[PDB]
Design a protein around this ligand. Structure first.
Ligand SMILES: [Mg+2]
Ligand SMILES: [Mg+2]
Ligand SMILES: [Mg+2]
Ligand SMILES: [Mg+2]
Ligand SMILES: [Mg+2]
Ligand SMILES: [Mg+2]
Ligand SMILES: [Mg+2]
Ligand SMILES: [Mg+2]
Ligand SMILES: [Mg+2]
Ligand SMILES: [Mg+2]
Ligand SMILES: [Mg+2]
Ligand SMILES: [Mg+2]
Ligand SMILES: [Mg+2]
Ligand SMILES: [Mg+2]
Ligand SMILES: [Mg+2]
Ligand SMILES: [Mg+2]
Ligand SMILES: [Mg+2]
Ligand SMILES: [Mg+2]
Ligand SMILES: [Mg+2]
Ligand SMILES: [Mg+2]
Ligand SMILES: [Mg+2]
Ligand SMILES: [Mg+2]
Ligand SMILES: [Mg+2]
Ligand SMILES: [Mg+2]
Ligand SMILES: [Mg+2]
Ligand SMILES: [Mg+2]
Ligand SMILES: [Mg+2]
Ligand SMILES: [Mg+2]
Ligand SMILES: [Mg+2]
Ligand SMILES: [Mg+2]
Ligand SMILES: [Mg+2]
Ligand SMILES: [Mg+2]
Ligand SMILES: [Mg+2]
Ligand SMILES: [Mg+2]
Ligand SMILES: [Mg+2]
Ligand SMILES: [Mg+2]
Ligand SMILES: [Mg+2]
Ligand SMILES: [Mg+2]
Ligand SMILES: [Mg+2]
Ligand SMILES: [Mg+2]
Ligand SMILES: [Mg+2]
Ligand SMILES: [Mg+2]
Lengths: 133, 75, 154
RNA sequence: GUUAUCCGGAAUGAUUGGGCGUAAAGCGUCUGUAGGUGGCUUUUUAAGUCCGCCGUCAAAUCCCAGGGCUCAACCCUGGACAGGCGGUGGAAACUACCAAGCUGGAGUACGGUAGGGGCAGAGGGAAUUUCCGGUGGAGCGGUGAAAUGCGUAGAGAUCGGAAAGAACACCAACGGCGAAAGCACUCUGCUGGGCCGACACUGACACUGAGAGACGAAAGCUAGGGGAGCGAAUGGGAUUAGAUACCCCAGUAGUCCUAGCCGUAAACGAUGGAUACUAGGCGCUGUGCGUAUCGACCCGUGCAGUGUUGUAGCUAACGCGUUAAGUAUCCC
């Protein structure tokens, strides 16, 4: 667990590729905020919190199989960017946009976490956490 | 009894099991299996000490003067 | 459109038993394309089987009002890797052999493409197809995400 | 047009943009110093980071907008994105710092239990060889077939004695421990790890590792012992055109022990390490729980490791598939 963000991302990517709607992830300010945002973009069905032995778990419901499990036209991609090895930042005029804007880019900035959309409205740059397709 | 998990107690238990192991390592010199363990445990103790030096300078110096532990290699 | 003609060989106690492989792609030039491969003794019959096979394998390429791709995409088949990205109208289709004939036969007017990795004509054709198959069009990402078009445009 | 030079194409030195099971490629294996990265919560600070404003980064060139040589090249005017450095004003999410906290990571104690882990010291029996006898009296031994060889100075065979060294039948198993090399007749002693169950405790003490250190099959070497069997070298006998080989008969180093050196192997899973996460089926080893009886099963299960098929996914194919060669992060 050297990187927590990357790990959440991964648990999703994996549970996704295996055609399961339900994922357990471990919560954190970052985790929680990212998932909130994921919901308001609409990449994921529903979130909720659980607690046991002072451990928090966000379970994520995921978008249902595409008109069967065998015939899938679409998957749901995720990619880590700024990672412990190399941290990537961008000013306002380099803010990434994904597939012409079909996908979303998550940014940690001075005003908190957001998408690239928010960053453009408010005129802010910052650290690029990940991309989502 | 005291703290059995405390830094200083652990470092003690280690220093002690090591000086104990020393006699066996002297009598049977061909036992490498055991020596490998010695080197491991000494490693542990050395780690804890480095940690403790980071966290509390005073408790550290007190400890290595107390248990007669050789002075650290950061000098 | 015959992309490639090769003479593959089976070997028998007699000698070399020669066949022709044909790699052929079909399109309407209107946004419908497919690939097919065939084998026979004569150029002609191979070509034909190639046609017939492609016609039963065929798919559709998502197009934009200017005749290009919705978005940037990669693709992978075997050692063939393929990179397509949309272009401004008036740049035409710039690419290499498999990728370019498939693209062009689909009716894509403006596209950037490059095949990285291998050069096999065939796997590059298939790869191109997997690329343009996974192309999502905006109406559909707006339908998936459950968000109005004008919101994603921004 | 040809030659020379440079960049391209070349993803062919790869940040964007590759690889290391079999294609070139994972140190033989660990321990560990610098170095890099490192869980969660609150606060602080503001070094990175971000936003605004100012100074400057000469003119020419490149880029945009006009104008002049009849056009163009070329010249002239005006202006600017990048990107850099420096000052100042703000933001505080993330990295970093500062203060206090938290256990699920890492450890410590406690109690269990399995084991060819290792070193040392005792003890054991088969079998083989030689020697000393008794019997017996012509061949033994060996090969594809022979011969060298051993034997009337009594061989082999068989019984009875001693003596010596080395290796440990059955158990043994697609089983056990070990970091790897390897470790098995038995036993005792000194000791290294492992794993499991309990909150008992500390509270990030972590992971990796350039240099460096320790261990490291066999052959080999130095010194002293020891010397049955086997057996390089060597010799004889064959076979063969030849036979410096294969086969046979002998047989020295060496194999063994003590104290060292050497540091190489297809040292192989041809697979560096740690962490997280992703179907099953059938098996085994250790323990724990509930059930079964109240002690052996039995069942279902929790872990820890170990084996065989196989889904997703991966791959050039073969195949790999929770013990990944899958999906990601960090170091070498
Ligand atoms: Mg910058
Ligand atoms: Mg590939
Ligand atoms: Mg190419
Ligand atoms: Mg290059
Ligand atoms: Mg790279
Ligand atoms: Mg390569
Ligand atoms: Mg080879
Ligand atoms: Mg190789
Ligand atoms: Mg290895
Ligand atoms: Mg080495
Ligand atoms: Mg280490
Ligand atoms: Mg360190
Ligand atoms: Mg740190
Ligand atoms: Mg953190
Ligand atoms: Mg200038
Ligand atoms: Mg002009
Ligand atoms: Mg003019
Ligand atoms: Mg000018
Ligand atoms: Mg500037
Ligand atoms: Mg500045
Ligand atoms: Mg803060
Ligand atoms: Mg702290
Ligand atoms: Mg005996
Ligand atoms: Mg006799
Ligand atoms: Mg093991
Ligand atoms: Mg023990
Ligand atoms: Mg405390
Ligand atoms: Mg090294
Ligand atoms: Mg040595
Ligand atoms: Mg040896
Ligand atoms: Mg010699
Ligand atoms: Mg012999
Ligand atoms: Mg000879
Ligand atoms: Mg002999
Ligand atoms: Mg020796
Ligand atoms: Mg080597
Ligand atoms: Mg190797
Ligand atoms: Mg049973
Ligand atoms: Mg397991
Ligand atoms: Mg296998
Ligand atoms: Mg398998
Ligand atoms: Mg591979």
């Amino acid at each position: 667990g050297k990187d927590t963000i990357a790990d959440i991302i991964t648990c999703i990517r994996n549970a996704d590729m295996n055609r399961k709607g339900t994922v357990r992830i471990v919560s954190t300010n970052i985790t929680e905020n990212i998932v909130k945002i994921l919901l308001r973009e609409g990449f994921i069905e529903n979130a909720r919190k659980h607690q046991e032995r002072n451990k928090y778990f966000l379970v994520l419901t995921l978008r249902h199989r595409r008109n069967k499990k065998g015939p899938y036209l679409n998957t749901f991609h995720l990619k880590r960017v700024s990672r412990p090895g190399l941290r990537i930042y961008s000013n306002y005029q380099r803010i990434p946009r994904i597939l012409g804007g079909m996908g979303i880019a998550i940014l940690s900035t001075s005003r908190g976490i957001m998408t690239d959309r928010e960053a453009r409205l408010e005129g802010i740059g910052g650290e690029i956490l990940c991309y989502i397709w | 009894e005291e703290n059995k998990g405390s830094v200083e107690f652990q470092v003690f238990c280690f220093t002690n099991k090591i000086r104990r192991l020393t006699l066996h390592l002297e009598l049977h010199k061909k036992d490498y299996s055991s020596q490998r363990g010695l080197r491991k445990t000494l490693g542990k103790r050395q780690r804890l000490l480095a940690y403790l030096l980071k966290i509390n300078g005073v408790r550290y110096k007190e400890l290595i003067s107390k248990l007669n532990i050789r002075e650290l290699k950061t000098r | 459109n015959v992309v490639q003609v090769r003479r593959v060989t089976k070997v028998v106690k007699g000698g070399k038993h020669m066949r022709f492989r044909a790699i052929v792609v079909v399109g309407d030039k209107k946004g419908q394309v497919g690939v097919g491969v065939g084998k026979a003794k004569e150029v002609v019959s191979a070509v034909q089987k190639a046609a017939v096979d492609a016609r039963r394998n065929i798919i559709t390429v998502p197009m934009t009002k200017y005749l290009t791709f919705p978005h940037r995409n990669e693709a992978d088949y075997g050692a063939a890797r393929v990179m397509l990205r949309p272009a401004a109208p008036g740049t035409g289709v710039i690419a290499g052999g498999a990728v370019r004939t498939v693209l062009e036969m689909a009716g894509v007017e403006n596209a950037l493409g490059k095949q990285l990795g291998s050069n096999n004509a065939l796997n590059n054709a298939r790869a191109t197809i997997v690329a343009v198959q996974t192309m999502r069009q905006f109406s559909d990402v707006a339908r998936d995400r459950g968000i109005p078009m004008e919101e994603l445009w921004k």
